[PDB]
Design a protein around this nucleic acid. Structure first.
Ligand SMILES: Nc1ncnc2c1ncn2[C@@H]1O[C@H](COP(=O)(O)OP(=O)(O)OC[C@H]2O[C@@H]3OP(=O)(O)O[C@@H]3[C@@H]2O)[C@@H](O)[C@H]1O
Ligand SMILES: Nc1ncnc2c1ncn2[C@@H]1O[C@H](COP(=O)(O)OP(=O)(O)OC[C@H]2O[C@@H]3OP(=O)(O)O[C@@H]3[C@@H]2O)[C@@H](O)[C@H]1O
Lengths: 176, 177
DNA sequence: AAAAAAAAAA
DNA sequence: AAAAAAAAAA
């Protein structure tokens, strides 16, 4: 389950054309074609097995609309997402290795290779995300009203994941 | 064939002889019989006569055979004790390097990097061809050899034209072209 | 003239 | 949650 969901993230977010799949402007690909692509590496994968990963994913990583499937965030190619805006959250969190602090405190959170900067409404998931890149990880606290007043709307892309264009430095209130 | 074996011989004698189960002495020498068997793990058709042909015909004097022992004469990334003669004849020496290294070289000077010694040449072509290994935009550095000797950095005759030195201070670099 | 296995950033 | 064959700095 974890292995296929990882390769599903690589296909839907980064290199769908590597498997001969062309996503539409919303990032959607046909579920039938992705199953055949997943079968190129793991032949035992079925459409039901794919619907299990989407239905049970603890982050709401994937979305199925009719006969199409997409990753809801994490893209490195630009897509057109229709997620609802988050006007509720007061604070948002981002985990990052300690080495990135001088540049983040100066330039703010940039999207890097992804289309959007990714933050979370949860401290654990934010810190867990940052641990993917290093050992000494710090928790960044982001004033969500600071972002809105500066014209950077936050969108509800996952259960707790939130995407935003970028985070200016003075919207980071605390590093722990 | 000849260029492929000579390349692998450069990797064993200069960089990782332990990977092939070879322990060099303090001069960098390895038994010629043991190196032949090491080259046979990759290229089974290599014989001692083939190896001796590479040493005798190498256009840079890369390798030295003393009795039953063989060594690379320079290029080492592990420290060795070389007995090469001192170069007291050369007035100028040459070093090729990519254009991007110039600001650092002009400030810190030529440093050995991963090798034991800085490598220069008495020949301009070989110096530029050495730098071409690292990039396209290569520049020719001119080195006053008296500047080096006066500053206590002796130059040694390691190859036909290759010369090894501890380091090259910046103000011994007279020209970059 | 520093070969080449095998692991995995962003 | 970016898989992964395969090539090659210094
Ligand atoms: N200005 C700046 N200078 C230097 N460095 C900066 C920077 N401004 C930002 N940085 C750092 O650059 C990294 C990019 O890495 P990148 O993978 O693009 O970003 P993230 O770690 O946010 O991951 C995304 C999603 O992917 C996971 O998978 P998922 O479980 O589906 O969700 C999770 C998660 O939401 C990151 O360390 C960030 O601080
Ligand atoms: N201060 C500084 N800053 C930045 N950069 C610097 C530097 N001070 C020096 N640098 C550059 O760092 C490179 C090291 O690369 P490295 O391969 O170690 O050096 P060389 O290119 O001199 O090659 C060795 C032998 O290897 C070939 O094989 P060979 O035919 O047997 O002989 C030939 C040759 O003598 C090099 O670009 C140098 O300028």
């Amino acid at each position: 389950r974890k292995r296929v969901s990882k390769l599903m993230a690589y296909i839907l977010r980064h290199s769908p054309e590597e498997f001969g799949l062309r996503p539409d402007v919303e990032g959607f690909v046909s579920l039938n074609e992705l199953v055949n692509a997943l079968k190129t590496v793991y032949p035992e994968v079925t459409e039901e097995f794919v619907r299990e990963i989407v239905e049970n994913d603890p982050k709401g990583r994937y979305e199925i609309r009719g006969d199409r499937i997409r990753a809801r965030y994490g893209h490195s190619f630009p897509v057109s997402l229709d997620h609802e805006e988050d006007t509720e959250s007061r604070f948002l969190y981002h985990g990052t290795p300690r080495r990135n602090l001088p540049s983040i405190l100066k330039e703010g959170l940039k999207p890097m290779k992804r289309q959007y900067v990714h933050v979370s409404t949860d401290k654990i998931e934010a810190l867990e995300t940052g641990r993917r890149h290093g050992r000494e990880v710090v928790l960044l606290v982001i004033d969500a009203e600071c972002l809105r007043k500066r014209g950077f709307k936050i969108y509800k892309a996952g259960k707790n994941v939130r995407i935003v264009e970028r985070v200016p430095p003075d919207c980071i209130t605390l590093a722990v």
